[PDB]
Design a protein around this ligand. Structure first.
Ligand SMILES: [Cl-]
Ligand SMILES: [Cl-]
Lengths: 191, 168
């Protein structure tokens, strides 16, 4: 499977074995239905707290575009999505809650995917990741794909003896396959 | 000697996080942060140089500053507070890995009891005080610096509280 030069020297060992299971890179799902396949309805990390119906539509619209682009452009992403569809997403009652407007996150260890559009918001300070070209700002595409990759693989960023982990490496590869210009993320935490 | 906050945490723009897999371990930005140069909360120790400890904990916005049910998380954090050795050869200290993790409303009493069990109570607020409503949208950073007296015995300096940090 395609990989990056920034990985192949000490590549993630957890991604490489999830690849052993996600092998169908074919474009057999319809891109404009991926959002419905992934998201059931609004719902935040906290049951008691509730999501704004308006921000839900805003975030879902953006999420749908990114899912569509990633599936049409990235064979690596088609593998994760296809596999996930066969296991759970085909079931209307196995889908994720979209915690729109909440801090980026997804429940891995009730299933929630928390996304927001603050990456485009002046009033927030950018958050950064480490690359060979110096610190890079997180953008919507990377943040959305990173959280979605969590939800399609059920994997964590914590990998013993790998500075990136499986989700970062997947995200790096998918974004490059999408024509995303951002430098790949060489480490999960700074140093 | 006394502690001085020379870079306050930024009050707004950063959401408290939950227990989940995120994109990164966030760092509370400093008040002077921009899209060009992000900053981090920073303190200065006046009148003392040498080894020491600093603990950072969360307390309520209004006095009496009870220990907040939320947690600080990130490098060198445990049981909801940050604690690490001071660089012994500097008087300026920045904290670039601070994160705020909010407790679910249903686990509030559980968090408060952990604050008590772990002796995380900067202003020694009585137990009978630590019930009632908490503002889960706002917290203050409490910097508790321990330096040394001339004989090398630990000497706790007066705590200093930051501006409030809001979730929205
Ligand atoms: Cl950052
Ligand atoms: Cl990433």
């Amino acid at each position: 499977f395609p990989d990056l030069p920034e990985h192949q020297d000490n590549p993630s060992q957890l991604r490489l074995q999830h690849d052993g299971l996600a092998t169908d890179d074919k474009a057999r799902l319809e891109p404009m239905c991926l959002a419905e396949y992934l998201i059931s309805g609004p719902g935040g990390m906290d049951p008691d707290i509730e999501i704004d119906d308006d921000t839900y539509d805003e975030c879902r619209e953006v999420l749908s575009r990114i899912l569509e682009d990633a599936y049409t452009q990235s064979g690596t992403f088609r593998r994760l999505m296809n596999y996930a569809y066969d296991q759970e997403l085909h079931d209307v009652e196995q889908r994720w809650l979209l915690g729109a407007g909440e801090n980026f996150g997804t429940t891995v260890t009730r299933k929630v995917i928390a996304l927001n559009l603050d990456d485009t918001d002046d009033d927030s300070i950018p958050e950064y990741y480490e690359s060979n070209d110096g610190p890079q700002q997180f953008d919507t595409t990377r943040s959305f794909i990173h959280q979605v990759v969590h939800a399609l693989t059920h994997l964590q960023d914590k990998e013993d003896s790998n500075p990136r982990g499986p989700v970062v490496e997947y995200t790096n590869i998918i974004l490059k396959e999408m024509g995303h210009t951002s430098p790949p993320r060489i480490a999960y935490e700074f140093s | 000697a006394y502690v001085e906050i020379i870079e306050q945490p930024k009050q707004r723009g950063m959401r408290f996080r939950y227990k989940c897999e995120g994109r990164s371990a966030g760092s509370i930005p400093g008040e002077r942060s921009t899209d060009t140069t992000k900053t981090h909360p920073t303190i200065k120790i006046n009148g003392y140089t040498g080894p020491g400890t600093v603990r950072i904990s969360l307390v309520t916005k209004d006095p009496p500053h009870r220990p907040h049910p939320h947690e600080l998380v990130g490098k060198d954090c445990r049981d909801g507070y940050y604690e690490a050795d001071l660089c012994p050869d500097r008087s300026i200290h920045s904290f670039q890995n601070l994160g705020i993790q909010c407790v679910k409303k249903r686990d509030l009493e559980q968090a408060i009891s952990q604050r008590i069990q772990t002796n995380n109570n900067p202003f020694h607020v009585p137990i009978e005080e630590q019930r009632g409503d908490y503002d889960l949208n706002a917290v203050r950073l409490c910097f508790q610096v321990t330096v040394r007296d001339p004989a090398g015995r630990p000497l706790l300096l007066t705590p200093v509280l930051s501006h409030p940090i809001f979730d929205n």
